[PDB]
A paper describes a structure:
Efficient γ-herpesvirus lytic phase replication requires a virally encoded UNG-type uracil-DNA glycosylase as a structural element of the viral replisome. Uniquely, γ-herpesvirus UNGs carry a seven or eight residue insertion of variable sequence in the otherwise highly conserved minor-groove DNA binding loop. The UNG leucine loop is a conserved structural feature which is responsible for widening the DNA minor groove and flipping pyrimidines out of the base stack and, in the case of uracil, into the UNG active site for catalysis. kUNG, in common with other known UNGs, comprises a single C-terminal globular domain made up of a four-stranded parallel β-sheet flanked by six α-helices, with an additional left-handed coil of three helices at the N-terminus.
The structure of kUNG in its apo form was solved in two different crystal forms. The disc-shaped structure of the leucine loop extension centred on the side chain of Q212 was not observed in the two unbound kUNG structures. Taken together, the unbound kUNG structures suggest that the leucine loop extension is highly flexible in solution. However, the absence of electron density for the leucine loop insertion in the apo kUNG C2 crystal form, and partial ordering of the leucine loop along with significant crystal contacts in the P21 crystal form indicate that the leucine loop is very likely highly mobile in solution. Mutagenesis suggests a model in which the kUNG loop is pinned outside the DNA-binding cleft until DNA docking promotes rigid structuring of the loop and duplex nucleotide flipping, a novel observation for UNGs.
Numbering used by the authors: 19 to 213, 223 to 253
Amino acid sequence: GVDDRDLLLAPKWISFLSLSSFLKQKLLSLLRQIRELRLTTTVYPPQDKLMWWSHCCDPEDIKVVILGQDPYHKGQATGLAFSVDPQCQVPPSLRSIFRELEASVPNFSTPSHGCLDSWARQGVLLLNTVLTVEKGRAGSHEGLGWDWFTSFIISSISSKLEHCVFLLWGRKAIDRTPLINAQKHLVLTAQHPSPRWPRFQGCNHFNLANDYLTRHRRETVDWGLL
């Protein structure tokens, strides 16, 4: 009943997630609502980038899941959490991320661009918990219906893979904790990187992720490859 291409997800992710006909409908209805909203408002990112994160990663090659809130809201959003097009300045959140890598990861030097696609090809999944935002208004799609979808993805990665690392940054990312199997994975939590939980400055998530990865005979992430 559902043309799987209307789901926008790469097909490796369709089979991995193996959404029921019901959940595919639920997703299609949300996608339709977003389209209708685009007639009155500007929504970021473009419709064709909402699932960009599925096109960069085969789901089995995931090593690290990084989870954000909602997309950048002033043009910068690419479809990958925290990443920016080369047309745009590195926003405060990514500058702060780089500052932590600069301070913590040997030979990391801060790039003049904010493109995180290199992390994606090394098996870092850069996921927002809410995949859209109205231009200008931060958090403005918070209760529109993305949450079941991103929660479903996090659960499936946790159930289907072994020994991934999840870096959960800020309250909404951290809410997904109960979905991740404590006997198989590592979760590291911090306060959100933009200026209750541990401070982001000093969290050392990047070296800790790699420590865990190397320990499970998996290949590290080269965070400085950008």
